[PDB]
Subunit: 131 residues, 3 copies
Amino acid sequence: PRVAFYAGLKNPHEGYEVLKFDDVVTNLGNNYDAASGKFTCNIPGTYFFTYHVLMRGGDGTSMWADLCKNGQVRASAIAQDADQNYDYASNSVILHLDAGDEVFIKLDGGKAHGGNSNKYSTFSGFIIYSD
Amino acid sequence: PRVAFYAGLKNPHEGYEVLKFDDVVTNLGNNYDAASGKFTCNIPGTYFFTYHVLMRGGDGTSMWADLCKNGQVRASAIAQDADQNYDYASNSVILHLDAGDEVFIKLDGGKAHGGNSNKYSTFSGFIIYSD
Amino acid sequence: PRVAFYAGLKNPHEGYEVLKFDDVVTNLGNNYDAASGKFTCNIPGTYFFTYHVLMRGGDGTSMWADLCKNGQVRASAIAQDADQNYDYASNSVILHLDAGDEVFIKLDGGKAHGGNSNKYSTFSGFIIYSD
Ligand SMILES: [Cl-]
Ligand SMILES: [Cl-]
Ligand SMILES: [Mg+2]
Ligand SMILES: [Mg+2]
Ligand SMILES: [Mg+2]
Ligand code: NI
Ligand code: NI
């Protein structure tokens, strides 16, 4: 089973919402959906995910981006700079997933930079083991 | 051989010490030990590790977190902000390990945020190849 | 096929150039070349890469580091701090590569810290799937 994806944000996002990474570069298995921003598991197993979300510079001082499995937070990150500089909220996880499980990044608050085609803000993952 | 782990810090750590990540989410192979903070290799091979350690905000300006293999530093990271903002010391490695080799993250100095169940500060790794 | 590498920067780099990571720790497959700073694919397939580039502290406020596939940017990152503190430009990708494809990190501008043997600034990658 080949499952591996990588997407850039493209569009700026601000405020509480799912980050819908819309510049999809790689998507083996077709399990990442840019319309919803969710990776949906169809092969149960253990997966690696990582994300790097760039806080917009020049306007705002804090930004929170968390990785979720279904309802639940499984990693948290903050970017913060009192001078309103660009900075990243990034983290990585390894999670076991059942078929139907959704994994996605949520913006808790603050402003994420959408870098158009530049892929400043990213979300990727792949299956390590199949059950 | 299935070896893959992911743990959050949970408890705040400050000053020189091994970071004992105590919120263990995934631990295929049972090779990560929260009591010691160490991953101990039992299957010789080549491994990926990554860590993301959040510096506490509101008190302190620098924090250093390094990945060690046995005695030796194999990656270094610093978080620094003169306004005492949250920021991350993060890095990633690929290392060959022999049976008995220990891999762990050490706090060299500064204050790491323990995010309780929020998994702000993290350590993960998995085997890529078995010898 | 075993392909997996990890290298530290070692030497300081400043201004537009390819980052030639010269402290090579792991290099299964011998596909990373410190002389050029490039990973060259010989086994077509899908690959994971990550990089963590530390901006020098005490002199300068911004630094840009991008991952390239051949001519083209496939991930971008910025480090920025108005007080001239250390900060990281980091990102991760998953890319399909054909034989002959080159992957490397370019410094677009600013000053990257070469940490000698300390491995503050790093580049790693491995093959997930072979075609
Ligand atoms: Cl793998
Ligand atoms: Cl100031
Ligand atoms: Mg949160
Ligand atoms: Mg150190
Ligand atoms: Mg650029
Ligand atoms: Ni910062
Ligand atoms: Ni700052």
